[PDB]
Design a protein around this ligand. Structure first.
Ligand SMILES: CN(C)CCNC(=O)NC[C@H]1CC[C@@H]2[C@H](O1)c1cc(C(F)(F)F)ccc1N[C@H]2c1ccccc1
Ligand SMILES: Nc1ncnc2c1ncn2[C@@H]1O[C@H](COP(=O)(O)OP(=O)(O)O)[C@@H](O)[C@H]1O
Length: 331
């Protein structure tokens, strides 16, 4: 089969950390695909815990590095007409949103297409209209942003209804690994020069959500999905139809009440321990992404961590968690 691919990304020290000359307890070595953590002692002598992953990125990693090495390959499979999912997992403040969405560089330095701080989502949409418009492919693109807060579903892209409007989900009559999400708005994206606008509306809606729900940005789970309908007309004249779907999942903070987060962990454990029963149905998150966990979707997890000594317990928790997920087998 194809085991779930797991990569670790350690973010750098923030400006409010360097002024204190903070000592890092995290060492990354991409070539060895390892991440080493200082668990005690001194900088002259100490013990450490090491873990090997499918890939490892350190503080110096740029957004372009992440996209080229992990996303590009995945997007290509999506273009081939396959289903793919990428999870962002880790403690609040470690880089989940930065990685999945990115942000705008300060003082309007670049346009959104050239902003080096752009994350996976914008780069993906942009490239999509770049690699397909390149070919004589007849294609369409739809996006949806589904968010889960306290086990309730919200549409963060519907410009018609406000966030407070919760959605309903049901099991799909056909697909046994799928569900039906009543009301989930799907937005057609005609061209890259329409991408930014769609994302801005999402960010804006997220602000109203923050107002209404406590610690919304750290406790919610978000699923940004992109579906590509393609009518390919190869140079040989044959017209092949393909449907590609990609799920960019930004999970709630993992730091020590969140039924979806608890269940995801239990689903992963059940899968790795080969336990007969997998509790997918015990949460909205796992029911919605059932196929991404031991199913027929290509899945990858980007675990984000802090290099600060103060986050040791949480960083170790994140690594152990990510480490275990490597043993999951999809098809
Ligand atoms: C001023 N500096 C300090 C902060 C500015 N950052 C900011 O406003 N940031 C929010 C906005 C900024 C613009 C996009 C938006 O988040 C956004 C919303 C979603 C969502 F899931 F909601 F649909 C998904 C991805 C993105 N990516 C951002 C992006 C970043 C770079 C290039 C292209 C697109
Ligand atoms: N690789 C990185 N390089 C530079 N800054 C980063 C990086 N990862 C995160 N940050 C910054 O640290 C803060 C937390 O990142 P964020 O992605 O919002 O965390 P999370 O979504 O995991 O809570 C933001 O201010 C962000 O700009």
């Amino acid at each position: 089969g194809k085991n779930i691919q797991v990569v670790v990304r350690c973010r750098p020290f923030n400006l409010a950390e360097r002024k204190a000359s903070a000592h890092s307890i995290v060492e990354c070595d991409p070539v060895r695909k390892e991440v080493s953590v200082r668990t005690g002692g001194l900088a002259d002598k100490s013990s450490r815990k090491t873990y090997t992953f499918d890939m490892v990125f350190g503080a110096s990693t740029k957004q372009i590095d992440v996209y080229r090495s992990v996303v590009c390959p995945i997007l290509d499979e999506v273009i081939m007409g396959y289903n793919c999912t990428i999870f962002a997992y880790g403690q609040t403040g470690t880089g989940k949103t930065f990685t999945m969405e990115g942000e705008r560089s300060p003082n309007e330095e670049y346009t959104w297409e050239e902003d080096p701080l752009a994350g996976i989502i914008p780069r993906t949409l942009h490239q999509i209209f770049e690699k397909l418009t390149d070919n004589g492919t007849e294609f369409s693109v739809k996006v949806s942003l589904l968010e889960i807060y306290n086990e309730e579903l919200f549409d963060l892209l519907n410009p018609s209804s406000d966030v407070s409007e919760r959605l309903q989900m049901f099991d799909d009559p056909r697909n046994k690994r799928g569900v039906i999400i009543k009301g989930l708005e799907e937005i057609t994206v005609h061209n890259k020069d329409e991408v930014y606008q769609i994302l801005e509306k999402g960010a804006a809606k997220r602000t109203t959500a923050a107002t209404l729900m406590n610690a919304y940005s750290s406790r919610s789970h978000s699923v940004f999905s992109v579906t590509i309908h393609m009518k390919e007309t190869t140079i040989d004249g044959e017209e092949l139809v393909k449907i590609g779907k990609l799920n960019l999942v930004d999970l709630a903070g993992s730091e020590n009440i969140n039924q979806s987060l608890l269940t995801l962990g239990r689903v992963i454990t059940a899968l790795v321990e080969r336990t007969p029963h997998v509790p997918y149905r015990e949460s909205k998150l796992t029911r919605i992404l059932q196929d991404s966990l031991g199913g027929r979707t290509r899945t990858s997890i980007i675990a984000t961590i802090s290099p600060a000594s103060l986050n040791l317990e949480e960083t170790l928790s994140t690594l152990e968690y990510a480490h275990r997920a490597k043993n999951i087998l999809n098809k």
